[PDB]
Amino acid sequence: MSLQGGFVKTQKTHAYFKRFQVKFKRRRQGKTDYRARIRLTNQDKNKYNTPKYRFVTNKDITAQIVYATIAGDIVMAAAYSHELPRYGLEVGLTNYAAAYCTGLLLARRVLTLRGLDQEYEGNVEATGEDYYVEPADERRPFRALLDVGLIRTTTGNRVFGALKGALDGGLDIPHSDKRFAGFKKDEKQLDSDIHRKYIYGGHVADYMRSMAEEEPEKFQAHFSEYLKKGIDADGMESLYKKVHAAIRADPTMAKSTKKEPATHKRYNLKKLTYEQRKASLVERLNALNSSAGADDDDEEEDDE
Amino acid sequence: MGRRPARCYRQIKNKPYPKSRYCRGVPDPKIRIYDVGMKKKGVDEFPYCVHLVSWEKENVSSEALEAARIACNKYMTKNAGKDAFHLRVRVHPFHVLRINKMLSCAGADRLQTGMRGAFGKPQGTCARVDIGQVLLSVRCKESNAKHAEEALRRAKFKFPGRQKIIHSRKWGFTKFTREEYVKL
Amino acid sequence: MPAGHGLRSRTRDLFARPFRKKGYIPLTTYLRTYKVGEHVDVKVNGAVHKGMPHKFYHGRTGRVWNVTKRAIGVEINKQVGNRIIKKRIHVRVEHVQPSRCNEEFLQRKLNNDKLKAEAKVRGEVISTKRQPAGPKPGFMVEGTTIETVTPIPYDVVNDL
Amino acid sequence: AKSKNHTAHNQSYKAHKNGIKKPKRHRQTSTKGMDPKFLRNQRYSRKHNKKSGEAESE
Amino acid sequence: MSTEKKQLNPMRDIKVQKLVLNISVGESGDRLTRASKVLEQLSGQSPVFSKARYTVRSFGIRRNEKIACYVTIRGEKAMQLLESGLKVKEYELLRRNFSDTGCFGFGIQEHIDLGMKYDPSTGIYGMDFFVVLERAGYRVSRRRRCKARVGIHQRVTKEDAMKWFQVKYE
RNA sequence: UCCGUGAUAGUUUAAUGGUCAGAAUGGGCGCUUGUCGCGUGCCAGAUCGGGGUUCAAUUCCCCGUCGCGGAGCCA
RNA sequence: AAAAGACUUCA
RNA sequence: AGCUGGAGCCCAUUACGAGUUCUAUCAGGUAAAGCCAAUGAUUAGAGGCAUUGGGGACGCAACGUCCUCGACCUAUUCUCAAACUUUAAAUAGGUAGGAUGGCGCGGCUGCUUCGGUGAGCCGUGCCAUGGAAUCGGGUGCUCCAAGUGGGCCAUUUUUGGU
RNA sequence: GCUCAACGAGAACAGAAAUCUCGUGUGGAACAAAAGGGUAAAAGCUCGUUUGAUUCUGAUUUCCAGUACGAAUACGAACCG
RNA sequence: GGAUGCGAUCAUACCAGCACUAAGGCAUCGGAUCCCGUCAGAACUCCGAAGUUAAGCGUGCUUGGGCGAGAGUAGUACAAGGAUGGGUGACCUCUUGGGAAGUCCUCGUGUUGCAUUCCC
């Protein structure tokens, strides 16, 4: 009939195909760039993975501090903005204030004095502070590197807002302030570097008030109450939950997820062979049929 | 024609040259049409095949290929009419002959000083015919098989690498007449 | 004729990757790290073009001489000549894979140590060598239900 | 007159008589031409190590 | 079997991905690039240069160089422009202008709409209008990050595109 | 034969630095002219075939066909 | 003044 | 430079060494195979398919129809490659099979670790025939010098050339 | 940041090649040059910022006498991007 | 089992055409004040209220294709050593060894680490 693409692959088959094993599975899903990844992994510095666009977005954002090993990664802490309303929060979970508090929470969690390995002098668990320039634990920022993932480095992002909460949480990310979502993006003060506008916790405050539909739960001031809240030292929650039920999930999943063939394949073949002899039209795909005689094999004998 | 003994390229001795892009200047291949006769049937109307199968691995010239082919075809028209059976020439002449060319006439030939060396100008081409290759495949019908056998016989004196006439069978002619009609 | 020596020559497949293994290397190789004196294979990534050793050195297993930034120093030995000496090559960690040539043997050394401890408990008598192939023992079957058929070679046909 | 240009013949025969040897195994093989760090720390540590070694043999 | 059987469009309904209005003659054959002015007024927004590649027939011997210009527009503005062109064309006619992609284009003079010939430096006899149309579910292939091939369902067809358009302003 | 060297309008041969080719004469067309001619205005290319490099080759390479010259011992 | 030459047979 | 001798120098069945095999583990693109796997060559049909390669016939016309010849496309088919190969031998080739080793104890650093965390190297303790096979009418090591610096041949492999 | 060689289907003019669009597209392109490898959210192609095409003096790899020299590799010590 | 983030092994994971997905999550999706961005808020960047499982995503299917695995695939082809073996040689037998690939036929069609979450 014509057709190209499909036809041009099947004729030359193998030549494309293997094209998906040029690169591998992670890239196929759209998860890992290997050009980005390779640069991080040599000295094995933790990935402060903070997605916020086309990953998890518009419901939640998340910050995980992740260490690598050769059998696959292993998070040293994680925290979700979905677990932020456990400590109180009811203003938008997609905003800078939410991202900042997730970063504060994560930094407190990652040690929690656990195991052997500490550092709580200096000051890890960095105070309730009005920022200016990166507060660390002296001279040396280590073991956390802002992993944006595949998302762009753009000033005024949630990723940089999370980074602020890491620093004011006692995590010590390497830094430069020329793409950071500055000081007042938490809501605070600013007025410096290349960056412009002081407000972004208090973005929304102007927006909504010029009337139009947006989130419930009140008003302009409401950010500050929960901005304060994630600074507090009552770490160590995230919910007890009811576990499993029986055999994996549900009857919906039982119908959905596994196989059939083996036994079932033979039945469909049997039906097909009967159909071929009962009518004679097409053996399936793209031609043949004139009694048939089972499977792909028939075409070779039906030549002469 | 002008002398060349077939012995010169007879030995399969040199590297095989079928790379047109490096081997520049290759002259005309010589068989006009490889398949002579029918070409609307294969084995359907021809439930007999006879082959001429190589006894000796040697490189048979394009010139010799033509000679064998034309003799066989001429017998077909002379003893079974114009649109008789079907001859197929089934090996094609990949291997470019270089070979020493252009001698002079001082008290040396071989121009430089007595090399001569590579950089041989191309003389022609051969098909490399290894042992058991089917040089000529002539399909026939079984009653008239003796005519095809005779045609191959006249042909066989006309190449350097000896071949033996054989009654060839593919999927028999008795496995074809089963397998066909069970899937038809 | 005085020396020249085209630096490569017959490196077509040696610098090539087969069709299935084209594209960028998994970062697992990079993340893999070695300590000094560990034995490791040399076998290049074709997608890193600087830090590459000379292709003859592939298929050699060397002892890590030292570890430095990006590339690792691996000491391997050249072949052919007189008094052929060990040579130290700067070679990428992308171009270094673990050899299993030592790994399996080291496990069998630990296995011997088990046997040594066991042996003393009994009242010594160690013997923790591996043993060469022994003679065959006897073998059975039953002649009941296995009376002879006759089988033959079969006649020549030319099939061509 | 032409002459031979190269041959690898006869080289092998000579090589298996007195040649090839092996590396010459020692404890503490040459770290000569090794990266400056490591070696720097070996120098510093050794000064202290001799003093302490006498203490730990009493 | 098109997954049509649902309840149709919230997702399925057509939209303008963009409307690309482009001038094609080629430099020296029409002008320097003073026809940027007429494009600027018509759309209301900036045109940008379009470069050339491959064999050309006309001066433009370097290839890469300004030769044409184009405006990618969209939203309400694109729909307004559409109405004027539809008002021309005969309606319930030609399959030809529709692509299998579900996109269509038409030709007609620049001057249609209220505007002076005099105020733009050129009047220009017309130029290809192309309309890029697709469904809502298109955005998966369009965005970079989580790019995925277009489904059978996700494709508009020539018949479908014409059918959606038939309802509105023709 | 080896080492060189060309070919471009009907003919004879200029030119380029990579984007682009000329002149003269012949011829074809008027005008001069009793009538032709001299004279006077008008006109007209496979840049050898051939691939390659290159954005783009008449132009810069490589091969080949033809036509030429000039060398090829102790003969 | 130097640009001026040709021009069939019966006749 | 190597081969060769001398003068020795150090130990001696301790020791390690080996034109060797095994074992176990690497590397390889030759023979060959392949071509309906990529690239390149190459034969033959057959069957499709055109909004624009060319003809004819049927038509006022058609977003018409039928034959025809080409392209292409598809499943076949045929035969090849030093400078093609997914694939792919054999004989060759490398490495390992331990006391020049492992393990315990506890020291130092300017390194490395946000952290004695780790790495390396030191003192001290524990474990023998015991780390496949086989052999070593011994081996290891250093200095110094002669001759050679035109090679030639056969089996096998192989390039040019009848 | 972007994805190409190519082809199909479309789009005033525009044909076999103009420019524009989408799909398919393992690299069939492009990376100065010879040829051969290699390479795809790049080393290509486009944009932005740039000047390490820098200072010192070794080791190392090739050719190999396990030499010089050139060129290459990866470090150090500097200073920069 | 699903999902999400990070993956490991690296085509049983891939291609083509279909089909199905509870829960909860991803996505698609609505908006353009703000940082940021273009020819175009389509991309990118930000806000996340209102939707939709159609696609993506996952999994399953179809004598499929490819890949993987096996074979009387084949003990074939080829090849080291030996012959005062056969043969004019080309080569070919045997002894002592090693041993493929495709055609072709048969069987298969992702597995699993970390963290958090979801079935009911």
Side-chain angles (χ1 to χ4, degrees), chain C residues 108-110 112-113 116 128, chain D residues 25:
Chain C
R108 295 166 185 135
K109 291 180 185 179
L110 298 171
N112 297 326
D113 300 309
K116 284 163 52 175
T128 46
Chain D
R25 298 178 178 179

Coordinates of all heavy atoms in Angstrom, one line a residue, chain C residues 108-110 112-113 116 128, chain D residues 25, chain H residues 96-102 127 130-132:
Chain C
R108 N 39.4 -18.9 46.9 CA 39.9 -20.2 47.1 C 41.0 -20.3 48.1 O 41.2 -21.3 48.7 CB 40.4 -20.9 45.8 CG 39.3 -21.0 44.7 CD 39.8 -21.3 43.3 NE 38.7 -21.3 42.4 CZ 38.7 -20.7 41.1 NH1 39.8 -20.0 40.7 NH2 37.6 -20.8 40.3
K109 N 41.7 -19.2 48.3 CA 42.7 -19.0 49.4 C 42.1 -19.0 50.7 O 42.5 -19.6 51.7 CB 43.6 -17.8 49.2 CG 44.5 -17.8 48.0 CD 45.4 -16.6 47.8 CE 46.2 -16.6 46.5 NZ 47.0 -15.4 46.4
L110 N 40.9 -18.3 50.8 CA 40.1 -18.2 52.0 C 39.5 -19.6 52.4 O 39.4 -19.9 53.5 CB 39.0 -17.2 51.9 CG 39.4 -15.7 51.7 CD1 38.2 -14.8 51.4 CD2 40.2 -15.2 52.9
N112 N 40.9 -22.5 51.7 CA 42.0 -23.3 52.2 C 42.2 -23.0 53.7 O 42.5 -23.9 54.4 CB 43.3 -23.0 51.5 CG 43.3 -23.4 50.0 OD1 42.6 -24.4 49.7 ND2 44.0 -22.7 49.2
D113 N 42.0 -21.7 54.1 CA 42.2 -21.2 55.5 C 41.1 -21.9 56.4 O 41.4 -22.2 57.5 CB 42.1 -19.7 55.6 CG 43.3 -19.0 54.9 OD1 44.4 -19.5 55.1 OD2 43.0 -18.1 54.1
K116 N 42.3 -25.5 57.0 CA 43.5 -25.5 57.8 C 43.0 -25.5 59.3 O 43.5 -26.2 60.1 CB 44.4 -24.2 57.6 CG 45.2 -24.3 56.3 CD 45.8 -23.0 55.8 CE 46.6 -22.2 56.9 NZ 47.2 -21.0 56.3
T128 N 46.0 -28.8 51.7 CA 45.1 -27.8 51.2 C 45.5 -27.4 49.8 O 45.4 -26.2 49.4 CB 45.0 -26.6 52.1 OG1 46.2 -26.1 52.5 CG2 44.1 -27.0 53.3
Chain D
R25 N 61.3 -9.7 42.2 CA 60.3 -9.5 43.3 C 61.0 -9.1 44.5 O 62.0 -9.7 44.9 CB 59.5 -10.8 43.6 CG 58.6 -11.3 42.4 CD 57.9 -12.6 42.7 NE 57.0 -13.0 41.5 CZ 56.2 -14.1 41.5 NH1 56.2 -14.9 42.6 NH2 55.5 -14.4 40.4
Chain H
rA96 P 51.6 -13.1 36.8 OP1 52.3 -12.2 37.8 OP2 52.3 -14.1 36.0 O5' 50.4 -13.9 37.6 C5' 49.6 -13.2 38.6 C4' 48.5 -14.1 39.0 O4' 47.7 -14.6 37.9 C3' 49.0 -15.4 39.7 O3' 49.3 -15.2 41.1 C2' 47.9 -16.4 39.5 O2' 46.8 -16.2 40.4 C1' 47.4 -16.0 38.1 N9 48.0 -16.8 37.0 C8 49.1 -16.6 36.2 N7 49.3 -17.5 35.3 C5 48.4 -18.5 35.7 C6 48.1 -19.8 35.1 N6 48.9 -20.2 34.0 N1 47.1 -20.5 35.7 C2 46.5 -20.0 36.7 N3 46.6 -18.8 37.3 C4 47.6 -18.1 36.7
rG97 P 50.4 -16.0 41.8 OP1 50.6 -15.5 43.2 OP2 51.7 -16.0 41.0 O5' 49.8 -17.4 41.9 C5' 48.9 -17.7 42.9 C4' 48.4 -19.2 42.8 O4' 47.7 -19.4 41.5 C3' 49.5 -20.3 42.7 O3' 50.0 -20.5 44.0 C2' 48.7 -21.4 42.1 O2' 47.8 -22.0 43.0 C1' 48.0 -20.7 41.0 N9 48.7 -20.7 39.8 C8 49.7 -19.8 39.4 N7 50.3 -20.1 38.2 C5 49.6 -21.3 37.9 C6 49.9 -22.1 36.8 O6 50.8 -21.9 35.9 N1 49.0 -23.2 36.8 C2 48.0 -23.5 37.7 N2 47.3 -24.6 37.5 N3 47.8 -22.7 38.8 C4 48.7 -21.6 38.8
rG98 P 51.6 -20.6 44.3 OP1 52.3 -20.2 43.1 OP2 51.9 -21.9 44.9 O5' 51.8 -19.5 45.4 C5' 52.2 -18.2 45.0 C4' 52.2 -17.2 46.2 O4' 50.8 -17.2 46.8 C3' 53.1 -17.6 47.4 O3' 53.7 -16.5 48.0 C2' 52.1 -18.4 48.3 O2' 52.5 -18.3 49.6 C1' 50.8 -17.7 48.1 N9 49.7 -18.5 48.4 C8 49.2 -19.6 47.7 N7 48.2 -20.2 48.2 C5 48.0 -19.5 49.4 C6 47.0 -19.7 50.4 O6 46.2 -20.6 50.3 N1 47.1 -18.8 51.4 C2 48.1 -17.8 51.5 N2 48.0 -17.0 52.6 N3 49.0 -17.6 50.6 C4 48.9 -18.5 49.5
rA99 P 55.2 -16.1 47.7 OP1 55.2 -14.7 47.2 OP2 55.9 -17.1 47.0 O5' 55.8 -16.0 49.2 C5' 55.1 -16.7 50.3 C4' 55.8 -16.5 51.6 O4' 55.0 -17.0 52.6 C3' 57.1 -17.3 51.7 O3' 58.3 -16.7 51.4 C2' 57.0 -17.9 53.2 O2' 58.2 -17.6 53.9 C1' 55.8 -17.2 53.7 N9 55.1 -18.1 54.7 C8 53.8 -18.5 54.7 N7 53.4 -19.2 55.7 C5 54.5 -19.4 56.4 C6 54.7 -20.1 57.7 N6 53.7 -20.8 58.2 N1 55.9 -20.0 58.2 C2 56.9 -19.3 57.6 N3 56.8 -18.6 56.4 C4 55.6 -18.7 55.9
rU100 P 58.8 -15.2 51.7 OP1 60.2 -15.0 51.4 OP2 58.3 -14.8 53.0 O5' 58.0 -14.3 50.6 C5' 57.4 -13.1 51.0 C4' 57.6 -11.9 49.9 O4' 59.0 -12.0 49.4 C3' 56.7 -11.9 48.8 O3' 56.0 -10.6 48.7 C2' 57.5 -12.2 47.5 O2' 57.1 -11.5 46.4 C1' 58.9 -11.7 48.0 N1 60.1 -12.2 47.2 C2 61.3 -11.6 47.5 O2 61.4 -10.8 48.4 N3 62.4 -12.2 46.8 C4 62.3 -13.1 45.8 O4 63.3 -13.5 45.2 C5 61.0 -13.6 45.5 C6 59.9 -13.1 46.2
rG101 P 54.9 -10.2 49.7 OP1 54.0 -9.1 49.1 OP2 55.5 -9.9 51.0 O5' 54.0 -11.5 49.9 C5' 53.1 -11.9 48.8 C4' 52.1 -12.9 49.3 O4' 52.7 -14.0 49.9 C3' 51.1 -12.4 50.4 O3' 50.0 -11.6 49.9 C2' 50.7 -13.7 51.0 O2' 49.7 -14.4 50.3 C1' 51.9 -14.5 51.0 N9 52.7 -14.4 52.3 C8 53.8 -13.6 52.6 N7 54.2 -13.8 53.8 C5 53.3 -14.7 54.4 C6 53.2 -15.2 55.7 O6 54.0 -15.0 56.6 N1 52.1 -16.0 55.8 C2 51.2 -16.4 54.8 N2 50.2 -17.2 55.1 N3 51.3 -15.9 53.5 C4 52.4 -15.1 53.4
rG102 P 49.4 -10.4 50.6 OP1 48.5 -9.7 49.7 OP2 50.5 -9.6 51.3 O5' 48.6 -11.1 51.8 C5' 47.4 -11.8 51.4 C4' 46.9 -12.7 52.5 O4' 47.9 -13.6 53.0 C3' 46.4 -11.9 53.8 O3' 45.1 -11.4 53.6 C2' 46.5 -13.0 54.8 O2' 45.3 -13.9 54.7 C1' 47.7 -13.8 54.4 N9 48.9 -13.4 55.2 C8 49.8 -12.3 54.9 N7 50.7 -12.3 55.8 C5 50.5 -13.3 56.7 C6 51.2 -13.6 57.8 O6 52.2 -13.1 58.2 N1 50.6 -14.7 58.5 C2 49.4 -15.3 58.1 N2 48.9 -16.3 58.9 N3 48.7 -15.0 56.9 C4 49.3 -14.0 56.3
rC127 P 52.1 -20.5 65.1 OP1 52.1 -21.7 65.9 OP2 53.4 -19.8 64.9 O5' 51.4 -20.8 63.7 C5' 50.1 -21.2 63.6 C4' 49.6 -21.2 62.2 O4' 49.6 -19.9 61.7 C3' 50.6 -21.9 61.2 O3' 50.3 -23.3 61.2 C2' 50.1 -21.3 59.9 O2' 48.9 -21.8 59.4 C1' 49.9 -19.8 60.3 N1 51.1 -19.0 60.0 C2 51.3 -18.6 58.6 O2 50.5 -19.0 57.8 N3 52.4 -17.8 58.3 C4 53.3 -17.5 59.3 N4 54.4 -16.7 58.9 C5 53.1 -17.9 60.6 C6 52.0 -18.6 60.9
rG130 P 51.5 -30.0 53.0 OP1 51.3 -30.0 54.5 OP2 51.1 -31.2 52.2 O5' 50.6 -28.7 52.5 C5' 50.4 -28.6 51.1 C4' 50.8 -27.2 50.5 O4' 50.2 -26.1 51.2 C3' 52.3 -26.9 50.3 O3' 52.6 -26.1 49.2 C2' 52.5 -26.2 51.7 O2' 53.7 -25.4 51.6 C1' 51.3 -25.4 51.8 N9 51.0 -25.0 53.1 C8 50.0 -25.4 54.0 N7 50.0 -24.7 55.1 C5 51.0 -23.8 54.9 C6 51.5 -22.7 55.8 O6 51.0 -22.5 56.9 N1 52.5 -22.0 55.2 C2 53.1 -22.2 54.0 N2 54.1 -21.4 53.6 N3 52.6 -23.2 53.2 C4 51.6 -23.9 53.7
rG131 P 53.2 -26.7 47.9 OP1 53.9 -28.0 48.1 OP2 54.1 -25.6 47.3 O5' 51.9 -26.9 47.0 C5' 51.4 -25.8 46.2 C4' 50.0 -25.4 46.6 O4' 50.0 -25.0 48.0 C3' 49.4 -24.2 45.9 O3' 48.6 -24.4 44.8 C2' 48.7 -23.4 47.1 O2' 47.4 -23.0 46.8 C1' 48.9 -24.3 48.2 N9 48.9 -23.5 49.5 C8 47.9 -23.5 50.5 N7 48.2 -22.7 51.5 C5 49.4 -22.2 51.2 C6 50.2 -21.3 51.9 O6 49.8 -20.8 53.0 N1 51.4 -21.0 51.3 C2 51.9 -21.6 50.1 N2 53.2 -21.4 49.8 N3 51.1 -22.4 49.4 C4 49.9 -22.7 50.0
rA132 P 47.5 -25.5 44.5 OP1 46.9 -25.2 43.2 OP2 46.6 -25.6 45.7 O5' 48.4 -26.8 44.5 C5' 49.2 -27.1 43.3 C4' 48.3 -27.9 42.3 O4' 47.8 -27.0 41.3 C3' 49.2 -28.8 41.5 O3' 49.4 -30.1 42.3 C2' 48.5 -29.0 40.2 O2' 47.4 -29.8 40.3 C1' 48.1 -27.5 40.0 N9 49.2 -26.8 39.3 C8 49.9 -25.7 39.7 N7 50.7 -25.2 38.8 C5 50.6 -26.0 37.7 C6 51.2 -26.0 36.5 N6 52.0 -25.0 36.2 N1 50.8 -27.0 35.6 C2 49.9 -28.0 36.0 N3 49.3 -28.0 37.2 C4 49.6 -27.0 38.0

